[PDB]
From a paper:
Green fluorescent protein (GFP), which was discovered in the jellyfish Aequorea victoria, is a light-emitting protein consisting of 238 amino acids. GFP absorbs UV–blue light and emits green light. The structure consists of an 11-stranded β-barrel plugged by a chromophore [Fig. 1(a)]. The chromophore is 4-(p-hydroxybenzylidene)imidazolin-5-one, which is formed from three intrinsic residues (Ser65, Tyr66 and Gly67) in the polypeptide chain by a post-translational cyclization, dehydration and oxidation.
We used two different variants, S65T and E222Q, for the B form. The S65T substitution changes the conformation of Glu222 by relocating the hydroxyl group of the 65th residue. The donors and acceptors in the hydrogen bonds among Glu222, Ser205, a water and the chromophore switch with each other from those in the A form of wild-type GFP. Consequently, the chromophore becomes anionic, while Glu222 becomes neutral. The Cζ–Oη bond in the A form is 1.365 (10) Å, which is 0.05 Å longer compared with those in the B form: 1.314 (7) Å (S65T) or 1.315 (8) Å (E222Q). On the other hand, the structures of the B form (S65T and E222Q) differed from almost all of them. The difference in the orientation of Wat3 leads to a knock-on effect on the hydrogen-bonding network between Oη of the chromophore and Oγ of Ser205. On the other hand, the hydrogen-bonding patterns around Ser/Thr65 and Glu/Gln222 are significantly different [Figs. 5(c), 5(d) and 5(e)], while both S65T and E222Q are in the B form. The hydroxyl H atom of Thr65 in S65T is hydrogen-bonded to N2 of the imidazolinone ring of the chromophore, while the corresponding H atom of Ser65 in E222Q is hydrogen-bonded to Gln222. Although both the S65T and E222Q variants have spectroscopic features of the chromophore in the B form, the hydrogen bonds between Thr203 and the chromophore appear to differ.
Residue numbers in the entry: 2 to 64, 68 to 231
């Protein structure tokens, strides 16, 4: 795609989110950069409204799959870069097993040379002292497979996957994800064969930062297609 050529180097990223979870309103701003050549993301997020009212890990998937590394032989399956620069809408329902749900709608597109992810998040049905509103999730992150399929009538894609959040008692909080993405612009986009993105993420803190924040280092590779 022409879109692909926009990602051969390091690209600066901005993330802006506004959220309302059970009437707790909040905002997050993030900055960093992506290097799709290496499937690599580096960002720092800051809650600008005070304390974040949900655990940071629960927002990772919401906070730019155009930075995944597509092997050369899988170039024809990279919807995400093909929609650039005009971008794509990304919508999800995230269902926290035996707790509430997030519904997210985001638009991912270039503003100048910067790749931007603008998100609105709404959370309902949460338990006041469940794992989310009760802040019972560990500050860490597991490795997943994101299963993608074409969604031809939308000129886009779907994804379906299961995120695992470790709980501080040693258990696990499942977050089922269902995702749909729709291109914004009028150039041709790539409608892929079924495949998956293999993810890994490391969460950390900046020792000099006293605002509520998250540092994220993430690597993602497309897989599941041999030729």
């Amino acid at each position: 795609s022409k879109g692909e050529e926009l990602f051969t180097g390091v690209v600066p990223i901005l993330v802006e989110l506004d959220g309302d979870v059970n009437g707790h309103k909040f905002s997050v701003s993030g900055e960093g950069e992506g290097d799709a050549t290496y499937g690599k993301l580096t960002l720092k997020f800051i809650c600008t409204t005070g304390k974040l009212p949900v655990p940071w890990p629960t927002l990772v998937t919401t906070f730019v799959q155009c930075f995944s590394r597509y092997p050369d032989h899988m170039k024809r399956h990279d919807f995400f870069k093909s929609a650039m620069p005009e971008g794509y809408v990304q919508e999800r329902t995230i269902s926290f097993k035996d707790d509430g749900n997030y519904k997210t709608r985001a638009e991912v597109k270039f503003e100048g040379d910067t790749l931007v992810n603008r998100i609105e998040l709404k959370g309902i049905d949460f338990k006041e002292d469940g794992n989310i509103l009760g802040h019972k999730l560990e500050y860490n992150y597991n490795s997943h497979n994101v299963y993608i399929t074409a969604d031809k009538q939308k000129n886009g894609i779907k994804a379906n996957f299961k995120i695992r959040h470790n709980i501080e008692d040693g258990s696990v909080q499942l977050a089922d994800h269902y995702q749909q993405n729709t291109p914004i612009g009028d150039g041709p986009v790539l409608l892929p064969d079924n495949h998956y993105l293999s993810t890994q993420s490391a969460l950390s803190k900046d020792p000099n930062e006293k605002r509520d924040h998250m540092v994220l280092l993430e690597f993602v590779t497309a897989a599941g297609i041999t030729h």
